[PDB]
Design an enzyme around this catalytic site. Structure first.
Site, PDB file in Angstrom:
ATOM      1  N   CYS A 161       0.910  -1.212  -0.210  1.00 58.02           N
ATOM      2  CA  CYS A 161      -0.107  -0.076   0.011  1.00 58.02           C
ATOM      3  C   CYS A 161       0.747   0.989  -0.002  1.00 58.02           C
ATOM      4  CB  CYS A 161      -1.089   0.033   1.103  1.00 58.02           C
ATOM      5  SG  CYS A 161      -2.373  -1.217   1.207  1.00 58.02           S
ATOM      6  N   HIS A 293      -5.519   8.992   2.937  1.00 64.94           N
ATOM      7  CA  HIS A 293      -5.353   7.689   2.539  1.00 64.94           C
ATOM      8  C   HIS A 293      -6.975   7.382   1.993  1.00 64.94           C
ATOM      9  CE1 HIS A 293      -3.063   4.085   1.530  1.00 64.94           C
ATOM     10  NE2 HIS A 293      -3.940   3.358   2.402  1.00 64.94           N
ATOM     11  N   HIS A 331      -8.892   0.654  -4.943  1.00 63.13           N
ATOM     12  CA  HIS A 331      -7.683   0.853  -4.125  1.00 63.13           C
ATOM     13  C   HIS A 331      -6.705  -0.162  -4.740  1.00 63.13           C
ATOM     14  CE1 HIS A 331      -5.497   0.754  -0.043  1.00 63.13           C
ATOM     15  NE2 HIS A 331      -4.518   0.690  -1.033  1.00 63.13           N
TER      16      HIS A 331
END
Lengths: 1105, 67
Positions: A161, A293, A331
């Site tokens: 990530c 985020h 994502h």
């Protein structure tokens, strides 16, 4: 240290093929998360039905990147896409990748998936070494370094990530300390294996709805997506376009956490943000937009937003806009940071903030949203101004933060050089790419920086990009020109024409450039003393300005020198140089043996000396007669002046005899035309008197003669004398000799190499026809100017464009004043304009490859080992023999036991053929065999349809008695006559069977058909089908009968090898016997009993008419 | 602010544990993912510095040492 800027940007994102489509989706509000089943069936294993997926993964322009087709299939789709994305990113910044070759540019790639490698390395019996080179995670950056020839660090980060943002931070650190001049930052994620999504779902990260509703009360998780993005980072100096500057970038880890590894910590993020914006010197109040985020997690969102509130919103009055791009596209784990970076850069470029989808009510645990300190971007908000913050926090606890200073370069003020036309040169893999570049450049023709950036990257060798085009922008006319570029290098030759080209007002248009005007003014300063100003002559309206010989000479030389200066400004260097009559001095300057002052002065003194003589008039006219015939045909006092070409020669002499000869020639019909001699003979005996004063004056002007060059081919000195003294140095003597010596122009044309590119340096391309006729057909002619043209600048730019289209590299930018850099904000993106060659589709792993049955592909192509099947044609169409099913089942059983086929004596029982499979002419058919060891049953299937079934098991105790030939149906046929191969298969053709040479295995068969001899070609299928043919041959029934059931088949390779015997030839045969009473067919080591044949329709379409 | 750099080029255990989607467990990823090779060390030892796992094609250990 040096400043770090984001020079270029590109990437393929969910439902967007490039960055322009990505922006169209972001601003348009179209949700980029889809419900289709492109990767795997929706709802598999209970997975969410929605996720972001690229449009296509099976495209790659392998030939451009030097990848053999075999390695392209075994290459990771991530790398296949990333090579193209990186190339697009490099050019997007206006930087030709050749400039970076050999430097210490670094490559940092953030990748967190190796699904492709797992699929290709699952079969140890067939996996190849390519899959290691192409699919290994270490090769994600090493392949880019290898292709682009970067000598800097090449690493592949694996932090989840944050891999892409961490790579960007590492590249920033490397460039900041001077380690690298530029860096490539990449992040890649592709969804191929459902098992990873199942792991994430089990962890509870994924959302049941599949929607990444960031900052909303109903946040169940995030939803996975795939994207490829690459960014070029360079020091302030190398950047052509600056999307934004990186004020500071840092990283830290959450460390030990009571809750667990996965639980995010907001205090650490707050510390990171505060430390970054303190060390960078930026005050918290400067920020305007924070790229949180925003994964939508029920725990991560409050933590991150409260950290941002405690770090930035503590003491700023105006609300701090906060947005997340994951609510738009989903994502992508490792490529998440670069996706947000791309969104921020696009928003800054276009001036609007793309909104966040799926935000309806704020999360109650975030007090910042309730009281208005943080403002979410519900609607497109125009950009006001300030720094931007991008942070991505890996689920493992690694934090990365970035501070950006958006570029705010205002559009440049209007300048005179913008009015005149510019040249755009484009290059591309295919004609559509060149057309796209040209059309996009034309649509923004007014943008000087964009055109300059496009021209910078167009310089690619014709091997890499074979299609080249050009388009003059802003001219009175001119559509784009597109055509292929022949391979190989092509010499460039300068041809400077002589007198007769000057026209009133010539060169005024070309003077609106700066280089040409500079050369003209320098020439004027050179010949100032005598009082002749070239600028005044060119600008003078009076037609007599170029009627005077001195003005004609001076202006012609000045214009040729200016044209040479313009050509040499772009970097063009001639390989040959040819001069016709005057212009030898200009040819000298192009070669270098003469300086501009010397050239202009020599031409002027040449002209003035010609005037002072006041010799009797002499008129020179071109003659359609050839050189040899005319030269002897010339009357006294008239000789051949110039050998322009074989077909035409020019003669100068006294007006009366020359006119009489011209009229005589017209009498004979030969081409006749009197060219402008100004009343003074040229290249004749008349110039002989003018020789002394001209030589003395040239010595006065020329005092340091310099050697001639190899490129220059002197046309005033006979080739046999090229080693002479005059041909050695371009001193005054050489010019004086050339004035009186005949012009042997056609003589030197033969030395022009094949495929030569010829530029005619002259105010008017007078000798274009002569060059066409007298030059090799492969050569190219380019005028560079024209008489009475509306705007000669457009013609010169078109000539330069044609020079570009011929493979020669000339950059139009050098002509016009340099463009101020960095480019103004809003310059159109260049990455979307790059088109590739995507005609071929490459293999990509499927969900069936990964874990969660023998397969045989019948290929009838000639090279295929199963080509013999083409010879088994039944009723005019090819059918797979039943013995083929038996053979594949036998091989499968042998593999299951481990023994070789020839070592396994097998038994079949209750074989049933449900349908007949038809082998197509092109392609293949996959036949799958499944065995049940316990039940001794087998099953052959095609496309999920049962085709054969029965029972197969090893023969434990073979009995040679079984293969003893049975008692004959007839004891004494007693007929010497018998059927041969030809007659047998004539009969079988009459019935309906068409067998080719491979299936014609019967050497002979008795008339009754019970007993015969069969061939043995080392093939079991052919042998057993031959036995079936022998069985059918005895049937009295007419029609086409095919097998349907076989009660039992016994095969014993040992007794087969023993039974075979050789004939007089080296061919090997097996004796066959058919017993219709006992329903048994015994041949060699094969024993078939109870064969049942059922009448086929025997109906064929398109019967002969 | 100590940092952890780990050079690892193999992820075979994650491939073995996640093969069967019906009986695979969620926390298998927290223990097998490449990124967790450094993240787990930082978590246990409580290091607040960079936590990176490199591959870099057979020179991963020395590249991590250089970093």
């Amino acid at each position: 240290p040096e400043e770090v800027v984001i020079a270029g940007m590109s990437g393929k994102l969910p439902e967007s093929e490039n960055l322009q489509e990505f922006w169209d989706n972001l601003i348009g509000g179209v949700d980029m998360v889809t419900d289709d089943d492109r990767r795997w069936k929706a709802g598999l294993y209970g997975l969410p039905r929605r996720s972001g997926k690229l449009k296509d993964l099976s495209r790659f322009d392998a030939s451009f990147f030097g990848v053999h087709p075999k390695q392209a299939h075994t290459m990771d789709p991530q790398l296949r896409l990333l090579l193209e994305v990186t190339y697009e990113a490099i050019v997007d910044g206006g930087i030709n990748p050749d400039s970076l070759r050999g430097t210490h540019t670094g490559v940092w790639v953030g990748v967190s998936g190796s699904e492709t490698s797992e699929a290709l390395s699952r079969d140890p019996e067939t996996l190849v070494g390519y899959s290691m080179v192409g699919c290994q995670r270490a090769m994600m950056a090493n392949r880019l370094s290898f292709f682009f020839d970067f000598r800097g660090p090449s690493i592949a980060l694996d932090t989840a990530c944050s891999s892409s943002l961490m790579a960007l931070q590492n590249a920033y650190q490397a460039i900041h300390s001077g380690q690298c001049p530029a860096a490539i930052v990449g992040g890649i994620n592709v969804l191929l294996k459902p098992n990873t999504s199942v792991q994430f779902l089990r962890l509870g990260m994924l959302s049941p709805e599949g929607t990444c509703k960031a900052f909303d009360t109903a946040g169940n998780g995030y939803c996975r997506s795939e994207g490829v993005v690459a960014v070029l980072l360079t020091k302030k100096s190398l950047a052509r376009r600056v999307y934004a500057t990186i004020l500071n970038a840092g990283t830290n880890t959450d460390g030990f956490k009571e809750q667990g590894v996965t639980f995010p910590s907001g205090d650490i993020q707050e510390q990171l943000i505060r430390s970054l914006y303190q060390s960078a010197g930026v005050a918290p109040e400067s920020f305007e937009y924070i790229e949180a985020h925003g994964t939508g997690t029920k725990v991560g969102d409050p933590q991150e937003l409260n950290g941002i509130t405690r770090a930035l919103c503590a003491t700023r009055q105006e609300p701090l806009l906060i947005g997340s791009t994951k609510s738009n596209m989903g994502h992508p784990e490792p490529a998440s940071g670069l996706a947000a970076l791309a969104k921020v850069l696009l928003s800054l470029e276009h001036g609007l903030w793309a909104p966040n989808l799926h935000f309806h009510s704020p999360n109650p645990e975030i007090p910042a949203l309730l009281d208005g300190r943080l403002q979410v971007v519900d609607q497109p908000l125009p950009v006001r101004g300030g720094n931007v913050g991008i942070n991505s926090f890996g689920f493992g606890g690694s934090n990365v933060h970035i501070i950006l200073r958006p570029n705010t370069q205002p559009p440049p003020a209007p300048a005179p050089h913008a009015t005149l036309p510019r040249l755009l040169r484009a290059s591309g893999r295919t004609p559509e790419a060149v057309q796209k570049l040209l059309e996009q450049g034309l649509r923004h023709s007014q943008d000087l920086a964009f055109l300059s950036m496009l021209n910078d990257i167009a310089a690619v060798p014709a091997t890499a990009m074979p299609f080249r085009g050009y388009a003059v922008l802003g001219g009175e006319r001119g559509g784009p020109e597109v055509q292929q570029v022949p391979a190989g290098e092509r010499p460039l030759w300068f041809i400077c024409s002589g007198m007769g080209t000057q026209w009133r007002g010539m060169g005024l248009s070309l003077m609106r450039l700066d280089r040409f005007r500079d050369s003209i003014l320098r020439s004027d300063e050179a010949v100032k003393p005598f009082g002749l100003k070239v600028s005044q002559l060119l600008l003078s309206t009076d037609e007599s300005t170029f009627d005077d010989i001195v003005h004609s000479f001076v202006s012609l030389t000045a214009i040729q020198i200016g044209l040479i200066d313009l050509l040499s400004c772009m970097g063009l260097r001639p390989d040959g140089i040819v001069g016709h009559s005057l212009g030898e001095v200009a040819c000298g300057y192009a070669d270098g043996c003469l300086s501009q002052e010397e050239a202009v002065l020599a031409a002027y003194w040449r002209g003035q000396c010609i005037k002072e003589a006041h010799l009797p008039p002499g008129a020179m006219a071109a003659v359609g007669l050839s050189w040899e015939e005319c030269k002897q045909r010339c009357p006294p006092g008239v000789v051949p002046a110039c050998h322009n070409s074989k077909d035409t020669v020019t003669i100068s002499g006294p007006q009366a005899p020359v006119f009489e000869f011209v009229e005589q020639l017209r009498k004979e019909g030969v081409f006749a035309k009197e060219v402008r001699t100004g009343g003074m003979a040229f290249h004749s005996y008349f110039m002989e008197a003018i020789a002394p004063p001209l030589l003395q004056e040239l010595k006065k002007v020329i005092r340091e003669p310099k050697p001639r060059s190899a490129r220059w081919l002197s046309t005033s000195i006979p080739e046999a004398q090229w080693h002479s003294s005059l041909a050695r140095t371009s001193s005054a003597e050489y010019n004086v000799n050339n004035l009186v010596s005949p012009v042997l122009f056609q003589e030197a044309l033969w030395h022009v190499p094949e495929h030569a590119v010829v530029l005619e340096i002259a105010p008017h391309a007078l000798l274009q026809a002569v060059l066409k006729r007298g030059l090799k057909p492969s050569c190219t002619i380019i005028p560079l100017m024209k008489k009475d043209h509306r705007d000669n600048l457009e013609f010169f730019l078109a000539g330069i464009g044609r020079l570009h289209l011929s493979g020669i590299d000339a950059n139009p930018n050098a002509l016009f004043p340099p463009v101020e850099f960095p480019a103004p904000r809003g310059t159109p993106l260049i990455s979307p304009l790059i088109k590739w060659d995507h005609s071929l589709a490459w293999d990509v792993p499927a969900a069936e490859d990964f874990p969660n049955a023998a397969i045989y592909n019948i290929d009838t192509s000639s090279e295929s080992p199963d080509h013999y099947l083409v010879d088994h044609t039944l009723d005019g169409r090819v059918l797979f023999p039943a013995t083929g099913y038996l053979s594949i089942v036998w091989k499968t059983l042998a593999r299951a036991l481990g023994l070789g086929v020839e070592q396994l004596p097998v038994v079949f029982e209750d074989v049933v053929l449900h349908q007949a499979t038809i082998l197509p002419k092109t392609g293949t058919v996959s036949l799958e065999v499944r065995l049940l060891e316990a039940s001794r049953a087998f099953e052959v299937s095609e496309n999920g349809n049962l085709v054969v079934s029965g029972k197969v098991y090893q023969w434990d105790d073979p009995d040679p008695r079984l293969f003893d030939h049975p008692e004959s149906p007839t004891p004494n046929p007693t007929e010497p006559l018998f059927l041969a191969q030809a007659e047998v298969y004539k009969e079988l053709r009459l019935r309906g069977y068409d067998y080719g040479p491979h299936f014609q295995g019967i050497l002979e068969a008795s008339l009754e058909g019970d007993s015969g001899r069969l061939l043995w070609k080392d093939n079991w299928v052919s042998f057993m089908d031959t036995m079936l043919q022998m069985s059918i041959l005895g049937s009295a029934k007419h029609g086409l009968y095919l097998p349907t059931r076989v009660t039992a088949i016994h095969i014993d390779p040992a007794t087969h090898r023993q039974k075979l015997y050789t004939l007089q030839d080296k061919a090997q045969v097996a004796d066959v016997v058919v017993s219709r009473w006992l329903r048994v067919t015994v041949a060699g080591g094969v024993h078939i009993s109870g064969l049942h044949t059922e009448s086929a329709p025997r109906r064929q379409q398109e019967q002969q008419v």
